[PDB]
């Protein structure tokens, strides 16, 4: 078990015995879960490993890129390794994506035209794609609702599965809807995450009442959760970004895409403009950070995956309300805690960053932070800025006053943020 | 003068007396203009210079962003000295633009909307562009035709200059017009520069019919040719490449935009989405190349300008139709040569490849573009791929070959490989 | 337990069920040692953590690094927090230093001056660490002989222990021995960080004045402690290894005593500068990144050692180090007493491998063969193999970024051999 | 001539008519030496360009190499360009030389063992090279003297020329004198350039009496100076900086060695260790930086050299005694300027900081490192001297060191911020 001087070192952070204790008794409850999600890696790490090997990737491979980037290898078999991974035709990684936001609006826009009616059936999707699709305040910054593009909406069912029922009642009664979205992440919420399983019901179902639907999967944080991914189950296309699971932590910046050819094209019309696509666009010398990135991706997601858990379970032993709890299949890293009290919500969080490598000596203070509605509080004590890959913690200042916990480049430092931020709360 | 070591190493690139008397008669002829063009750089130095003092630009400004790149104000600061240099009210440089037809689409996708109509006051633009609009295929891709925004144009007059007559009737004719394109750079074409002053003709005569509408001005290979700049004269807002002028041969990749703050944010949702814009994206630590790329652009500008007169001359001695001529007044940093001749006008272009830093060596013969009908034949060597401020050249294979010389970071290197080509048709 | 299309998967690979049956019994057998390196790799995760927070790393430490690079925050700290993880007073992590030999030879080079012998304590040194040193066939390249530095040398115990009684008659009768060299990496039994402090003692207590250097290569967090936690002066080790995380593009590290450390630094750069000047290139972060994985990813190629030494046993093979022992580095070595075994056994680890999967894998020019396909060039903390073909024709196997990939490579290898 | 609007915009900065008619009167002035400038520079640009064609350059050569970076072909054809550009057999050009005194440092370690001695001819060496030496303090740091190599020196006369009488003498008299160093750059001295003219007279003179004897050239800032380099007239050997001219105002760090395979592949073992050499080393990605830095070297040199041209010549009119003179044939780009007064020296350098683009507003003032100096630094590459600079030692009789400029116009931009603060 953990060293004497593990537990002496630990004294000099104020991590008391009640923690410690706790903490143990946590640790041995979920080591059955743990076994689980090693042979879940193992595949997805042979996964990738073939990915590359086919590929043929080699050192010439790591190209530094200028200009217009014609002829880039680098990024061309970068983009056919995903296009592996993901099982897909064609796929679209690329570091010019300021963000995951930008990945998911490229494929909105690259997708929809004129006429065109959207239908997310996960219900409300992720906060700053508000202003992208235009379901609220719609100002004239140029959103899906201001091109003609128009927005319905289907929520989930009160337990947090699909209304699949309710999904073909609003496709047959519009038939104006050419793309489906799926949110995979709960993301600022109170429900379990969508299982490969959940979304092959909306994607057969759908599909079932016209084959010609496009079916978009917001693949935030469920990157390598489980062997197969949305792409396996009949999903046209995806999107997510680079400085979170897929990402590895090395990955700087960055989104990326996997889809149909025509999905994939249409995207990256989005990204750059008509006629150039993804001719163009030159890596910043970055091309290896992102393929040892997607190496170490299965690797890594499951010690954040695992921090989750290990979180999930040491805080419902300490009385707060959980969700996931530990012992539920996850489909991505992040772990919410309910507190029901703001004292302890912001200690929370000051305690994951004081628990982080870089910016421990900062203190976190809720940040009016872009797209999202309330000011969001981060704890993003990361080497890459803001990535939740990292061991990281962040909640809209707003009751229920819960905090959600994600990330870990390695299972002992996301488990030592834990511990720190934990003693911070209670003595 | 010459010395007699600088002529005898050039004979061991062919080059004969004939060539170099009939140099020597072009360099003395062009002595006054170069004096034009000395004066005018001091400025755009001085100008340029004062846009970063202002800015209190530091080493600390040299910033290396990841992830989402909040508060980057390297990114920041260096959109402040191009609005300075500019004197514009915003301004928005990244090296996400994959080339300049990425700014420029990003200009117009964000300035238009369904129902707005667009209309180029220089006749037909550039071939790289058509698709963004959709004038041509409008094969699905998401042009501007494709999202309800319609296109109109008005030709020059014979003479060069705008036909401000006409301009008047199609805006009072159509109300719908909310943005007027203007190319300052000749391109493929066989006419007078268009000047700043013939610019704020352009300006004042549509903005006098209705002050709304956005004078939007393609501002490639024209930065710092004239003390004023198209912002100067009126324009709502301008857009270019990095590659090109203003990045002063150091800078990697990426464009800029600079005009009022509505422009600018309204650019920046297509650049990235609505409701974030320009508040995320990293600079992949290329900033200071940036910075240093602005600072050394009016210098490096025209040390290509002093090679394309140069080159007017030097040709119009040797007895070739040259636009524009060595004495007239420039918008851009191109140069034509009118041969009447297919295999003039190849050995122009292999002598142009030959006498260049980066692949000398390589091949240089007419190949086919993937969607026009004629050949085309280019001279390009350059450390930053694709980069036009450096020594390169271009034509189509069609009477009566014109070819387009253009770039040269030091004047020498622009002579040399002008006399390396000249040399290789007059013996 | 390995799931139904894992093992389907991995039929694609040639893997049949003699190499899986046996490496499953391989896999439940070494679950205690795994264990044991599960609790040595939290206090170094640990150790590594605070070493950042105690020095204040932020963001604005990555900043850009240009021309002399005077007061550059982001090198000096990084210095700060390596002396911080080893305990020592001063470091000097530079990514100037080509490979761990520049690193190794600085060090020399910087401490020894004409007249002082030098002393290696565990036999003859890493075989490229020779013409630094120019014990034999010297061209005028500048060795440490040519300079008038003098070598000398005492090998191990028969048993792979020290031996400290040798090592006391040779300093006692030889007052010129101002510097004693340990090698930490090792067909032997590897030399443990308790066996580390026995050498320094036993030279310490002769003549105090001695400097303990340790070349440090591959021991990068394999126990709590490090040789300068046992009285060494000084240490030194390739970034591209264990300490880089797989993330470090280049450079070499030292951390000791801050004399060492200033006296090196001078054969680094020059006498008057020494630290002073050395930008980092635009790749510092890598460099604290790596260091913050590094206790983990130094254990995942540990524990890909650890599974290659108890399967091969199982197949037949000799092995060393065992699967139950007690480790100095990642190294594991496989006597196969066969040429085509040695040789389709790297041929199988070089098509494991992410990079260079299609390239040939045939002996180089006595004679030696290689298996390298790493995003980093030549890093041995990634999934790599070599060895000389000579009986008993011993492989060397070493990395993997993640147990898993070192899992991969090493199942595809044996499936060759059966 | 200047435009309305330019003068305009220069009385923003305080720049009153006195100044600015000097200015006039300065440019009017030094035309012809400007014109002598340009047909070396044009010789220059064609030499570059001939070595980049000659190695037949690529875009594959901007290698992005990593560990060891075997087989790297970026920085091995850059090592051939340079030979190419100097003439030489071999060459080394690493980002991994901190500075030009790190490859300097290098030179010397690598060519020279113990019992051997050293000679400078060109009287006492550039002021941090004396620690490496090891020629007055001898800290057990490891100088050349603490590794048994032994140092002389050999004044210039009195003229600023060489004494090539001496040099004879104290080659003959110690045989054990295998190295002469000759520094380029006229350092901080108040006397004539030494040409490369010169150098081959002092090349000529020792090989006469030893050919054996290996002429190493310390040529900072003497890059692209002349058509002819100091290896064109017998240079065994020589060194320099990166951040100063031959990196154009490009190169973010390093320093290069040109000359015989013999002495480049020594000095590369002092870089590294015996054994490998040169033979390790990952470029990080830059080497494209410092190709280009190559190319723009000849034209930005002659920037800079402009500008110090212009200096020399407005000063003097301003009543100032400089040093070198506008119409004197040059060694390196530092033009250094006589103030006899402390306040004038100090608001000389507060003005150039002034008209830097980077850390304009820091105020520099003066500040100890054997008595106070003052800097003007404020540059894109920290330290680089190419970039507009200057430094000065606050003593009498108060001499300034300007040097640098990416562009004349910068240069002289400075330069009438500065004088302004001066005169009238």
């Known amino acids: 078990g953990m060293l004497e ?15 410690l204790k ?5 640790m041995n409850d979920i080591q059955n879960q743990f076994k689980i999600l090693d042979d879940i890696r193992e595949f997805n790490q042979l996964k990738v490993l073939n990915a590359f090997q086919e590929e043929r990737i080699s050192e010439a491979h790591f190209t530094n890129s200028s200009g217009y980037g014609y002829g880039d290898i680098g990024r061309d078999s970068l983009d056919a390794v995903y296009a592996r991974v993901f099982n897909t035709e064609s796929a679209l990684v690329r570091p010019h994506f300021v963000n995951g936001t930008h990945a ?4 909105l826009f690259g997708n929809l035209r004129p006429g065109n009616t959207m239908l997310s059936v996960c ?22 609702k201001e091109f003609g593009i128009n927005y319905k909406q289907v929520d989930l069912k009160e337990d947090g ?24 992440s709960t993301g600022y919420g ?17 599909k079932n009442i016209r084959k010609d639907i496009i079916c978009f999967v917001d693949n935030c944080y469920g990157e390598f959760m489980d062997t197969k991914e949305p792409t396996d189950v009949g999903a046209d296309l995806i999107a997510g970004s680079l400085i979170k699971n897929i990402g590895g932590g090395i990955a700087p910046t960055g989104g990326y895409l996997a889809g149909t050819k025509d999905c994939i094209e249409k995207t990256s019309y989005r990204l750059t403009v008509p006629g150039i696509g993804g001719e163009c ?7 290896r950070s992102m393929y040892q990135g997607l190496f170490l991706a299965p690797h890594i997601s499951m010690e954040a995956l695992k921090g989750a858990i290990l979180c999930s379970r040491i805080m419902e032993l300490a009385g707060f309300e959980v969700m996931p709890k ?8 992040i772990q919410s805690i309910k507190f029901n009290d703001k004292d302890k919500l912001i200690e929370f969080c000051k305690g994951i960053q004081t628990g982080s490598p870089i910016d421990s000596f900062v203190s976190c203070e809720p940040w009016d932070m872009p797209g999202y509605t309330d000011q969001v509080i981060m704890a993003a004590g990361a080497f890459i800025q803001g990535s939740s890959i990292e061991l990281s913690a962040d909640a809209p200042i707003r009751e229920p006053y819960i905090a959600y916990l994600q990330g870990g480049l390695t299972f002992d430092h996301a488990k030592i943020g834990i511990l720190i931020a934990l003693s911070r709360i209670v003595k």
């Open 281 to 287: 666009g030159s890596t910043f010398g970055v091309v």
């Open 161 to 184: 599965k699909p209304n699949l029922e309710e999904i073909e009642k609003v496709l047959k009664e519009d038939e104006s809807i050419t793309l489906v979205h799926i949110q995979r």
């Open 5 to 19: 001087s593990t537990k002496q070192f630990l004294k000099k952070y104020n991590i008391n015995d009640r923690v």
């Open 123 to 144: 219900g409300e999707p992720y906060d700053t794609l508000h202003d992208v699709i235009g379901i609220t305040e719609n100002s004239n910054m140029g959103s899906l």
């Open 22 to 26: 706790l903490y143990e008794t946590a």
């Open 326 to 333: 530990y012992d539920e299949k996850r489909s991505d890293i």
């Open 104 to 107: 998911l609006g490229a494929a």
């Open 190 to 206: 109170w429900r379990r995450a969508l299982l490969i399983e959940d979304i092959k019901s909306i994607v057969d179902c759908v």
